Write a protein that binds this ligand. Structure first.
Ligand SMILES: *[C@@H]1O[C@H](CO)[C@@H](O[C@@H]2O[C@H](CO)[C@@H](O[C@@H]3O[C@H](CO[C@H]4O[C@H](CO)[C@@H](O)[C@H](O)[C@@H]4O)[C@@H](O)[C@H](O[C@H]4O[C@H](CO)[C@@H](O)[C@H](O)[C@@H]4O)[C@@H]3O)[C@H](O)[C@H]2NC(C)=O)[C@H](O)[C@H]1NC(C)=O
Lengths: 48, 52
């Protein structure tokens, strides 16, 4: 997340479209990936 | 005399002290990608990193 913010700030004031697009994609990608990881982890460690 | 030669395993220390400091140094380096017009952000990075 911190590196994503750094990238967004880098591309701000030069390619605002790219920065906005990557921020919008991250807002969905990060929570979904975290939830999938949590599901997999708990499933694989609560059934052994 | 009965002697033992003990070699210390390092994995615990990699997990405990080496990786965190490496990551904190990377964090420190993140400061150089922030526009040098922002003072509060870069000083926040540096001071927080030092204290960590
Ligand atoms: C962990 O730590 C301990 C503590 O230091 C180590 O213990 C030492 O082990 C070495 C060898 O394993 C000991 O050295 C041995 O000394 C014997 C007696 O020495 C006499 O002869 C020499 C001259 O050869 C004189 O200078 C000395 O004053 C004595 O009069 C030797 O007999 C041993 O063999 C030697 O000679 C034969 C001859 O056939 C050779 O083949 C050998 O290669 C070797 O040259 C050997 O030298 C040493 O004394 C121990 N320490 C103490 C305080 O006694 C452990 O080795 C170390 N490691 C581990 C895994 O525990």
């Amino acid at each position: 997340a911190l590196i994503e913010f750094a990238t967004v700030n880098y591309f701000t004031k030069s390619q605002p479209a790219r920065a906005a697009k990557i921020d919008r994609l991250s807002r969905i990608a990060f929570p979904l990936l975290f939830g999938i990881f949590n599901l997999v982890y708990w499933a694989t460690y609560l059934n052994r | 005399s009965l002697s033992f030669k003990l070699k210390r395993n390092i994995g615990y220390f990699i997990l405990q002290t080496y990786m965190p400091s490496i990551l904190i140094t990377i964090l420190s380096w993140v400061s150089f990608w922030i526009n040098y017009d922002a003072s509060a952000a870069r000083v926040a990075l540096g001071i927080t990193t030092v204290l960590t």
